[PDB]
Structures are given as structure tokens and as C-alpha cells.
């Protein structure tokens, strides 16, 4: 399942020690910022494809992980950074799934060493 | 998965013989009106997603079907057309993710007879 980080010592572990060599989506999200059931939805299926299987989806309150937040510089929520062996590889802002989908293929593509896509 | 339809047997069967008390999604496409990569990978997280395990999902295209298309009086691509048991429960204009889904879960909701949500 995607998972709701509530720590800092769980977020080290689930971004360094435990993330290998897959990609690490950390979605930002405030209560505030709350994107519509529907579009829940949308998101929950795209974590739930099996094409995705090996990549992290880490759900972080931006509010209530303050600590999380300033490290990153959050700005603006809703909002996706994609991390990659313990770099960030590319951040979006907002919550379009089309735009979350193709940053999410780009990121695949720019990890895959041996071949050009 | 998804399937293709071709053939007015095979549409007529996946329609009524074997829908039995599923919920079928009707999606009527044509190459003029292909939505881009990105939000086709957003429909097959939908169709793949294990909460729409009863779900039959059926993709025809609008100009090789014609029959379909007209016996449906389609005048707008893309299109979504759900039906339960041989009726028409709901229509959407469109290919917006989140209206999708929403209309989606509205049917689901409308063939439960035994509990309202």
C-alpha cells in the first residue's frame, strides 16, 4: 500500500536504507489541500497498477511533518517529488493525474541505464 | 482485461448473456479523438484497479462499429455509456478521469438495492 509517513527515523529508513534502487514518489498533502474523492480515486488506482509495482508511494502531511517539509522547501501543496537512490529526479506541483502519470514514465525512462526510451 | 470489440455477436453476448448483473462500461473512441498516452495509462490504472474487479470494461471504436455507435445514437467521442442489465444507468461526455470515476461509483451505488449510499 502507499505509505503514510508520521516519523522522521521511517522516512530515513523508507528513503535510504530500504529504497534500493526504485523510485521513491513522496506525495505532500494538507487538509487544507484535499484533493476531491474522486481524484483520490484516480491516485489510489495509479499506486495500485501493477506496472508500479516497484516504485514507493510515500503519503507525507505536509503540516503535520514539519520537519519533512522544510527539508524539501515545500512551497506548495498538493505537490510530488520523486526521489531516486537518495536524489531528487524531478517535483511537480498539483495533483493532474495525466501530468503525475507522465512524470512518473519520464522517471522510469531517465533510471533505465542501458537503454535510450 | 479491457475488451476490444469488433463484432456485433460478440457485443451482443459481453452485453447481455454474460453481463449477468455486472455493471458494463461502454468507452467509444475513434483515432480523431485519441487521448493522449498519459490519460489512457490513467484509464488502465481505473480498469485495472481491484475494487472494479466486477466491472466489465468495453472499448469500441466509434467508425469501425458503426452499427453500435448508431444503435446508441453517439454523437460526441470520446463517450462512456454504463449499463446494468440491459439498460442505460448513466452517459458522460468525455474522457475526465475524476468524472469517470465519479460516475462510476454513482452507478455502483444505484444498483445496490439492499442498502443506500
Keep these: 500500500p502507499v505509505i503514510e509517513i508520521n516519523d522522521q527515523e521511517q522516512f530515513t529508513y523508507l528513503t535510504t ?5 526504485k523510485l521513491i514518489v513522496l506525495y505532500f498533502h ?3 489541500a484535499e ?3 474522486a481524484l483520490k480515486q484516480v491516485f489510489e488506482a495509479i ?6 509495482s516497484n516504485v514507493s508511494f510515500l503519503s507525507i502531511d505536509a503540516d503535520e511533518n514539519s520537519e519533512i517539509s522544510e527539508l524539501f522547501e515545500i512551497s506548495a501543496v498538493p505537490y510530488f517529488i ?10 511537480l506541483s498539483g495533483a493532474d493525474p495525466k501530468e503525475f ?17
Tied chains: 1, 2.
Aim: with cysteine; proline share 5%; aromatic share 2%.
Design 17 to 21: 536504507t530500504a529504497a534500493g534502487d
Design 35 to 37: 484533493p476531491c474523492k
Design 101 to 117: 502519470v507522465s512524470l512518473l514514465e519520464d522517471c522510469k525512462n531517465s533510471v533505465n541505464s542501458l537503454e535510450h526510451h
Design 47 to 52: 499506486s495500485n497498477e501493477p506496472s508500479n
Design 82 to 91: 520523486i526521489i531516486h537512490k537518495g536524489t531528487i529526479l524531478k517535483e
Design 30 to 32: 494538507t487538509s487544507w
